Design a protein around this ligand. Structure first.
Ligand SMILES: Nc1ncnc2c1ncn2[C@@H]1O[C@H](COP(=O)(O)OP(=O)(O)O)[C@@H](O)[C@H]1O
Ligand SMILES: FC(F)(F)c1cnc(N2CCCNCC2)c(Cl)c1
Ligand SMILES: [Mg+2]
Ligand SMILES: [Mg+2]
Length: 265
């Protein structure tokens, strides 16, 4: 169906491990979109074709306003091209580097938008497993959108792929290679809530080996400026035991969320 020839390419939007993402406009319709470019050689040397297919499968079929759309794909012997919804206000990552810390209202609104999208996902037993600021994008009204379903699967699951980069958002069961479920995304939600308020993730460390130690032991402390209600939500989400983590509904109905979020469930 589609091919490269159908598109005028524009400025580089961002870069990932395999992904190189470009602004693009579709010649006949003038539709603006984002083109994610993957190199087949890199994909094969890493053996992550199954991830690519899972990404295309899962994300093309989901439909939620806080989830980034995927319209289609094509290839051309060197590369694979995913055709995505363009997010005009960039990443949450970028926004956090601009402001250093988010206030409480900004944080709770992001958490609500996140919890809504994740609840939709979990209702299909889809778990994302790679929730972090580089993979959260912003729509034209500033609304949060989850993206990059490269690592998503159906629960329950084990991990058959090597953990490549940062450990900062992964729960103890994932880094210890154990079996896991939905509750992994709840842990990541706690990590995110903390990093939104403090400006760095709660188990951050200088080396891999040490980050690993801080996560399996759940060693984190709060700065003075973190309020009691934020502390309560975060302490509930960062439980070593998955079953002790709240349901998403309890996150959306938590007093601190309801008092600070400007969007509803
Ligand atoms: N739809 C999009 N709109 C705007 N920027 C994007 C979009 N998709 C990706 N980007 C930018 O490119 C980066 C890499 O995209 P991603 O899909 O996460 O690739 P990877 O799977 O390699 O991490 C993102 O972190 C973001 O900065
Ligand atoms: F170039 C793209 F990305 F493939 C593309 C082209 N036309 C599109 N539209 C027509 C179909 C219904 N949606 C409204 C616009 C879309 Cl959504 C994507
Ligand atoms: Mg990514
Ligand atoms: Mg990926």
């Amino acid at each position: 169906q589609w091919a490269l020839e159908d598109f005028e390419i524009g400025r580089p939007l961002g870069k990932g491990k395999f992904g190189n993402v470009y602004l693009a406009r579709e010649k006949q319709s003038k539709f603006i979109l984002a083109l994610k470019v993957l190199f087949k050689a890199q994909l094969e040397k890493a053996g992550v074709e199954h991830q690519l297919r899972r990404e295309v499968e899962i994300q093309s079929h989901l439909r939620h306003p806080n989830i980034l759309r995927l319209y289609g794909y094509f290839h051309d012997a060197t590369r694979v091209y995913l055709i995505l919804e363009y997010a005009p206000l960039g990443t949450v990552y970028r926004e956090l580097q601009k402001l250093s810390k988010f206030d409480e209202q900004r944080t709770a609104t992001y958490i609500t938008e996140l919890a809504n999208a994740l609840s939709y996902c979990h209702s299909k037993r889809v778990i994302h497993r790679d929730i972090k600021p580089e993979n959260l994008l912003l729509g034209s009204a500033g609304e949060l959108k989850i993206a990059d379903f490269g690592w998503s699967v159906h629960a329950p699951s084990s991990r058959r792929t090597t953990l490549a980069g940062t450990l900062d958002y992964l729960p103890p069961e994932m880094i210890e290679g154990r079996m896991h479920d939905e509750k992994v995304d709840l842990w990541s939600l706690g990590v995110l809530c903390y990093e939104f308020l403090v400006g760095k993730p709660p188990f951050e460390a200088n080396t891999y080996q040490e980050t690993y130690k801080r996560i399996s032991r759940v060693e984190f402390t709060f700065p003075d400026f973190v309020t009691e209600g934020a502390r309560d939500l975060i302490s509930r989400l960062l439980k070593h035991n998955p079953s002790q983590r709240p349901m998403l509904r309890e996150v959306l109905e938590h007093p601190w969320i309801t008092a600070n979020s400007s969007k509803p469930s």
